[PDB]
Amino acid sequence: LVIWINGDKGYNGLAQVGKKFEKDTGIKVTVEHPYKLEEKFPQVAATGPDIIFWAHDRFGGYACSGLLAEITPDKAFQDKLYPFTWDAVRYNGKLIAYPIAVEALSLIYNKDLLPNPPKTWEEIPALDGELKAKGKSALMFNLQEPYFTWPLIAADGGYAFKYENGKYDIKDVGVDNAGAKAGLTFLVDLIKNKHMNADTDYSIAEAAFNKGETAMTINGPWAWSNIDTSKVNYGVTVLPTFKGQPSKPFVGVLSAGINAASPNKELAKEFLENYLLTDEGLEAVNKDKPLGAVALKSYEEELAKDPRIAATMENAQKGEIMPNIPQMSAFWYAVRTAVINAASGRQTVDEALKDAQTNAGAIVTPYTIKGESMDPTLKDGERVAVNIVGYKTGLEKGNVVVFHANKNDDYVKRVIGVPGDKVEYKNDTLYVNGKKQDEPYLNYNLKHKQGDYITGTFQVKDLPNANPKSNVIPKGKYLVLGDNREVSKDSRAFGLIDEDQIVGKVSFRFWSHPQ
Amino acid sequence: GGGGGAPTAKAPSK
Ligand SMILES: OC[C@H]1O[C@H](O[C@H]2[C@H](O)[C@@H](O)[C@@H](O)O[C@@H]2CO)[C@H](O)[C@@H](O)[C@@H]1O
């Protein structure tokens, strides 16, 4: 068995459970902690680990992609774990991973620098003034990952996707409401006033707190081990309020999923049910890096005695279980970008969260191209990402669109004219609204043609589904052509397509970008 | 989501 778990978790402890499994069974267990494993997994899934550990939020995306086996615990095993933990790992009615532990961020503070932690975020600027006077700082935490800034953003009313009547509404995104703006503004104000630095990452903040340089950090239970070693006299407490409102962390359930392509699903099941998820197994991992509030009732009964676990659960209770839906990946990426751009000054808070709002709810789905009509822009076999276009929503000239052509087939072509546009071709020259428009994406085909012209003279008025009296494209209609104009079967053959046929726009990577 | 392989977008020739 190959096992992947994040580098901040107790992977040495997990390896010890692995060694016990090997000693009992002969089956060798290799624990790896790759950089950005949560992103590597989908690439290698069909090659990677037999078991992947991550918080539950990533698993719906994995399952949606067919990368995970349904897990089959019996009633007796299920009863050993808290019911709410099984909720976190259920996607589309099916259990898709084993829950291990509940993780929530807490405020961690140095009792020698700060005997009373601040009740409110608002106090931090003044507190930092005092600490700077002795060459210290009030607060350092990972500004590079939105997980850590989320509690403050959500405090006064930010949310990811609205959960109502048993479902998440991915159209209802709460990334740019007043609460979110207020939280992110406060964060940016901290940075503007030098109470924090925009470049502070996980390792910088951890080193700072563990060396006694900063009075507070924000981190999860896995961080307590290193603090123990550092000998800092620390406390773990409730996050401060913002505008009177508790901070609201997104709560993760560390979970273990089984690769759908693993030839060792039965061995994985044995390892997780009978070695890891036992008092002994969890203790081995916990003693390495603390897990938080474990999913196994019998062991949690011991761990819940710890004041630090009480603080972890208290913060959890103010926050919310992360959604596990496939859209979660897009949400995190959008929020990460917003916080980075706001914190560095590239965008104002309003600009940043406006974009994040759009990006967080934008559905992206894979397609595979088949055929030559878009060559060389898209090639036969090419994998692409398609940004789903909302019903009756912003299609523009130049967008490459996927649309339903008939009951069986989706096609991909380029939008050359939108409703209201007057369009005609004179030879290979495109006229839109009386003005010649350059088509740089045809450059290669224009210069490697068999005939006199690749597109040829035609007018919209002559095409099926057009207004026979005008070159002005009717309401709800689109003119689409394939980039491989000499071979393409497109609007020239089948006429204008309707708005309700359109699925989405193909996203393109531009080859150039700044350094 | 469904767990199925990615859909196909045809780029049809005449
Ligand atoms: O920052 C976005 C990130 O947040 C969460 O990742 C956490 C993870 O849950 C914790 O176990 C810990 O390792 O720290 C990570 C933050 O650096 C989400 O689980 C993850 O999907 C998301 O990208």
Author numbering:
A (entry chain A): 13 to 59, 62 to 407, 409 to 530
B (entry chain D): 201 to 214
Lines quoted from the article behind this entry:
Bacterial type I signal peptidases (SPases) are membrane-anchored serine proteases that process the signal peptides of proteins exported via the Sec and Tat secretion systems. They belong to a group of serine proteases that utilize a Ser–Lys catalytic dyad, which differs from the classical Ser–His–Asp triad found in most serine proteases and in the eukaryotic endoplasmic reticulum signal peptidase complex. The human pathogen Staphylococcus aureus has only one active type I signal peptidase, SpsB. Here, the crystal structure of SpsB, the type I signal peptidase from the Gram-positive pathogen Staphylococcus aureus, is reported, and a peptide-tethering strategy that exploits the use of carrier-driven crystallization is described.
The third peptide, Pep3, is similar to Pep2 but has proline at P1′, making it an inhibitor that remains uncleaved in the complex. The hydroxyl group of the nucleophilic Ser36 is directed towards the plane of the P1–P1′ scissile bond, 2.9 Å from the carbonyl C atom, but the rigid P1′ proline pyrrolidine ring prevents further approach. This is likely to be because the rigid proline pyrrolidine ring at the P1′ position prevents the P1 residue from further approaching the enzyme. In Pep3, the proline at P1′ prevents cleavage, both for steric reasons and because proline, a secondary amine, cannot readily accept a proton in acid–base catalysis. In the Pep2 and Pep3 structures, the P5 proline directs the peptide chain away from the enzyme, with no residues prior to P5 making contact with the enzyme. In the present study, the SpsB–inhibitor peptide (Pep3) complex represents a model for the pre-protein–enzyme Michaelis complex, whereas the substrate peptides (Pep1 and Pep2) give a picture of the post-cleavage state.
